[PDB]
Amino acid sequence: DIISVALKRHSTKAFDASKKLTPEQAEQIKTLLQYSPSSLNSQPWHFIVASTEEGKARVAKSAAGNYVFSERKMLDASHVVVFCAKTAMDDVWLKLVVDQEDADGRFATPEAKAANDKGRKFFADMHRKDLHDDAEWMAKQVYLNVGNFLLGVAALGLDAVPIEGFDAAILDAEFGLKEKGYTSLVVVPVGHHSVEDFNATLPKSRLPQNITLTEV
Amino acid sequence: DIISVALKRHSTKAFDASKKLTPEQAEQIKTLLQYSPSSLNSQPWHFIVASTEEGKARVAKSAAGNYVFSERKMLDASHVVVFCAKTAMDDVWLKLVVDQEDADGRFATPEAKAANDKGRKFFADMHRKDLHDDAEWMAKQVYLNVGNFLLGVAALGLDAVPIEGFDAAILDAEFGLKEKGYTSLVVVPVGHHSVEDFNATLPKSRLPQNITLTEV
Numbered sequence: 001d002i003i004s005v006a007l008k009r010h011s012t013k014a015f016d017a018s019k020k021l022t023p024e025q026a027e028q029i030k031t032l033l034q035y036s037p038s039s040l041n042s043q044p045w046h047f048i049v050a051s052t053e054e055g056k057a058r059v060a061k062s063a064a065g066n067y068v069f070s071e072r073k074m075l076d077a078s079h080v081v082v083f084c085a086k087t088a089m090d091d092v093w094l095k096l097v098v099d100q101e102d103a104d105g106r107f108a109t110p111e112a113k114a115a116n117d118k119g120r121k122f123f124a125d126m127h128r129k130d131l132h133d134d135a136e137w138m139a140k141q142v143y144l145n146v147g148n149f150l151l152g153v154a155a156l157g158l159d160a161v162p163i164e165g166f167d168a169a170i171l172d173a174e175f176g177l178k179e180k181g182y183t184s185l186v187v188v189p190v191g192h193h194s195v196e197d198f199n200a201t202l203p204k205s206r207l208p209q210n211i212t213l214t215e216v
Numbered sequence: 217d218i219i220s221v222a223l224k225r226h227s228t229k230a231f232d233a234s235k236k237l238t239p240e241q242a243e244q245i246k247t248l249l250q251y252s253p254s255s256l257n258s259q260p261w262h263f264i265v266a267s268t269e270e271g272k273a274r275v276a277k278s279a280a281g282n283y284v285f286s287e288r289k290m291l292d293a294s295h296v297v298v299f300c301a302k303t304a305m306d307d308v309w310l311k312l313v314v315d316q317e318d319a320d321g322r323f324a325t326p327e328a329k330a331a332n333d334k335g336r337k338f339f340a341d342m343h344r345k346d347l348h349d350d351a352e353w354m355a356k357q358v359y360l361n362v363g364n365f366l367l368g369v370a371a372l373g374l375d376a377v378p379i380e381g382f383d384a385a386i387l388d389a390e391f392g393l394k395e396k397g398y399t400s401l402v403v404v405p406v407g408h409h410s411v412e413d414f415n416a417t418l419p420k421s422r423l424p425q426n427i428t429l430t431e432v
């Protein structure tokens with residue numbers, strides 16, 4: 001059950017390089033990335049899934065020097081996902097979303113499709129023109145995806161760790177993300193922990209609900 | 217099977233107000249909120265869980281103006297969670313986190329505790345004093361929580377919908393959040409869908425991996 005998963009999962013501090021995802025598992029992690037929800041189904045994201053040694057080494061270049069402890073985790077894990085946000089919400093993307101919803105059969109009529117599109121455009125424009133927060137708004141959706149993904153991979157019986165400890169300017173350059181309209185936010189190595197993962201056996205810790213939670 | 221969960225869950229558009237969470241489920245959703253991961257275990261969040269008629273009505277004040285379509289979702293669901301971020305990161309919070317980690321048994325020695333605290337302070341200060349993005353950085357952690365939560369509640373067999381379509385100034389005012397040091401970000405009604413939930417039967421739609429996902 002899912003509460004067991006939530007209580008037992010942890011941030012892996014060291015991975016066993018010999019233990020690879022199965023082909024089935026490697027497909028499943030892609031499914032999780034794709035099927036996360038997002039505001040307006042805006043899906044303002046790109047994922048880099050590095051499974052080869054040379055692909056993982058390219059991602060690991062982002063932690064060289066200043067984030068050396070992140071470096072090893074990225075090399076040892078089986079698969080390493082880089083979560084990227086769009087840097088701007090263009091109309092081409094908005095049309096791509098609504099056209100895919102139509103292709104998938106979500107609209108009974110042209111009127112329903114046009115209403116969907118107009119609604120999405122309205123809130124997108126608000127973020128960009130009035131709140132001046134479109135980059136942050138899209139980045140929030142990517143973090144939501146990360147949350148979904150962490151729980152998902154734990155439920156599959158896999159180990160992971162989310163990493164903000166990397167140099168996004170280096171990762172961005174390595175993969176030419178700026179020119180493509182994306183920026184890297186979180187790196188998540190996935191695989192199986194080694195005996196050197198001291199965090200596998202430490203108790204979890206969270207603030208008590210009497211501090212963080214009000215019931216009304 | 218968490219992939220089945222991810223592929224079958226959906227954003228509920230209409231709730232059956234007579235179908236309440238069980239007592240155990242109401243505790244389980246609180247566990248999911250508490251046990252989300254977060255950068256540095258910073259846990260920069262507060263949750264309001266509305267389960268009474270009075271409580272839900274208070275939240276539903278925020279479904280005004282452009283956001284009236286959210287109102288029924290908030291009133292008819294069994295339990296409505298307001299996800300809030302801290303508005304600033306302070307040392308008092310940082311000390312609370314590390315002291316809890318110590319109480320839970322995460323540190324073998326004084327030296328280990330003091331290293332943990334120093335590292336957390338270093339990165340927290342980088343956000344607040346150098347990047348000037350601590351509000352955004354904290355809100356990102358809250359969104360991660362939401363993503364964990366939506367998959368969690370689906371895995372419990374519960375329906376939910378994440379809502380950004382509410383007026384956060386209205387909600388903040390109603391619950392006195394600003395003075396308490398928090399701001400409302402996402403509202404998530406939880407319960408069971410009705411037969412008038414048109415989204416329960418519509419196909420799910422996502423962009424193809426050939427657009428969103430690069431393998432290396």
Ligand SMILES: Cc1cc2nc3c(=O)[nH]c(=O)nc-3n(C[C@H](O)[C@H](O)[C@H](O)COP(=O)(O)O)c2cc1C
Binds near residue numbers: 253
């Ligand atoms: C967005 C995010 C970024 C994180 N960055 C790092 C990181 O760079 N290195 C690290 O060792 N752990 C990292 N963590 C892991 C957290 O310290 C961990 O999630 C937290 O202490 C709670 O522990 P748990 O994940 O074992 O439940 C990060 C977590 C999140 C959510």
Ligand SMILES: Cc1cc2nc3c(=O)[nH]c(=O)nc-3n(C[C@H](O)[C@H](O)[C@H](O)COP(=O)(O)O)c2cc1C
Binds near residue numbers: 036286380382
């Ligand atoms: C952060 C966030 C905010 C959302 N805001 C709303 C909202 O105000 N009202 C609404 O009906 N749905 C809202 N949605 C639901 C999305 O439209 C939905 O997640 C998306 O179309 C994907 O469909 P699914 O959740 O059924 O998989 C929101 C989703 C997210 C993740």
